[PDB]
Amino acid sequence: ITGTSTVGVGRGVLGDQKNINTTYSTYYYLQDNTRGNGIFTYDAKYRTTLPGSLWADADNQFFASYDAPAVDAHYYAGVTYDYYKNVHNRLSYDGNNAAIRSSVHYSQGYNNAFWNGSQMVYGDGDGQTFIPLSGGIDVVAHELTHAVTDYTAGLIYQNESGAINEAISDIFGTLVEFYANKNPDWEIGEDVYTPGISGDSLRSMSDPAKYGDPDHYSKRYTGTQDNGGVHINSGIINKAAYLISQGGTHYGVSVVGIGRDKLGKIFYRALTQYLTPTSNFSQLRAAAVQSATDLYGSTSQEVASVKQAFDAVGVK
Numbered sequence: 001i002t003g004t005s006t007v008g009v010g011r012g013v014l015g016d017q018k019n020i021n022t023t024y025s026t027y028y029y030l031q032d033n034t035r036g037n038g039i040f041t042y043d044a045k046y047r048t049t050l051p052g053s054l055w056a057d058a059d060n061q062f063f064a065s066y067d068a069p070a071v072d073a074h075y076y077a078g079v080t081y082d083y084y085k086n087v088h089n090r091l092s093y094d095g096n097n098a099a100i101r102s103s104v105h106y107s108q109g110y111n112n113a114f115w116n117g118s119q120m121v122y123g124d125g126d127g128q129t130f131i132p133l134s135g136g137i138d139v140v141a142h143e144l145t146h147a148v149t150d151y152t153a154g155l156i157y158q159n160e161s162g163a164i165n166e167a168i169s170d171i172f173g174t175l176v177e178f179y180a181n182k183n184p185d186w187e188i189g190e191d192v193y194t195p196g197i198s199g200d201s202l203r204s205m206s207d208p209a210k211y212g213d214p215d216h217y218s219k220r221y222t223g224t225q226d227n228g229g230v231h232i233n234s235g236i237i238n239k240a241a242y243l244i245s246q247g248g249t250h251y252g253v254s255v256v257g258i259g260r261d262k263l264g265k266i267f268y269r270a271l272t273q274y275l276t277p278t279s280n281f282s283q284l285r286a287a288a289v290q291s292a293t294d295l296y297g298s299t300s301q302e303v304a305s306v307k308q309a310f311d312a313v314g315v316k
């Protein structure tokens with residue numbers, strides 16, 4: 001909508017107060033004009049018609065229970081935009097400042113969030129399995145990273161290419177969570193999963209097998225569920241990424257960690273310069289090796305650690 005840029009205030013899903021960028025034209029809308037061609041947040045009103053209505057508020061205060069998922073979708077889309085611009089020099093998901101659109105209050109009791117090819121979509125959860133999923137910065141950043149991937153490598157969402165697609169979303173979702181630096185970890189979705197249970201998450205990058213996911217190629221899933229295991233086999237790559245950053249010894253193979261910033265640089269370059277729609281795990285290792293060689297040199301510690309991490313998880 002055409003209007004003037006304003007700054008509202010509200011509370012997110014976890015009860016934290018934050019300032020949001022809004023637009024005033026009769027109502028105050030969740031339209032942030034400060035980032036690219038805008039960040040836009042919509043109300044799906046418990047239905048499944050998308051995007052729904054651009055979020056309108058009479059007073060620019062967003063403290064109602066019903067407001068909280070909107071606040072967080074809007075705010076955390078902004079953080080994710082800032083991460084890509086400031087860390088990777090990328091302007092929105094398409095690299096040309098595409099508008100970022102999100103809808104909240106999708107369906108009733110909907111225990112998921114997704115990128116639909118055009119926008120973000122967030123359920124409210126059923127209140128037991130999940131609370132509203134935009135409350136997780138890693139969740140928001142995971143979903144927006146699918147848009148990045150789709151515009152860049154274009155990894156097909158099945159089998160090994162799909163597990164890479166998922167791992168890239170977990171990797172950058174985590175790196176965004178560290179960038180914001182509130183309560184960061186190498187777990188996925190802990191802030192919105194199972195409010196009645198402390199210390200769990202959907203997936204772990206540091207120890208995928210904590211939630212039943214493989215941490216070595218020899219344990220890969222080859223059945224048909226989950227698009228050939230895209231959220232299962234992602235654990236193999238997630239573990240490799242964790243080892244590259246943090247180091248460790250895994251199945252007897254020791255990796256020297258090189259830290260989060262270098263992990264991000266290596267994987268961002270692989271995603272944007274080397275991976276293709278049909279890349280498999282072997283080809284990801286090659287892409288990451290080439291990326292780290294470009295950035296650091298063939299005889300670098302960074303290259304050595306990339307190779308050691310893939311070796312550790314059985315990917316040649």
Ligand SMILES: CC[C@H](C)[C@H](N)C(=O)N[C@@H](CCCC[NH3+])C(=O)O
Binds near residue numbers: 133139142143188202
């Ligand atoms: C990043 C988390 C987000 C919910 C994502 N769409 C996801 O990982 N979903 C998988 C895990 C289950 C989510 C709720 N049932 C999924 O398999 O869809």
Ligand SMILES: [Ca+2]
Binds near residue numbers: 057058059062063
């Ligand atoms: Ca209000």
Ligand SMILES: [Ca+2]
Binds near residue numbers: 177183184
């Ligand atoms: Ca956390």
Ligand SMILES: [Ca+2]
Binds near residue numbers: 138186189190
């Ligand atoms: Ca996390």
Ligand SMILES: [Ca+2]
Binds near residue numbers: 190192194197
């Ligand atoms: Ca929990």
Ligand SMILES: [Zn+2]
Binds near residue numbers: 142143146166169
């Ligand atoms: Zn995903």
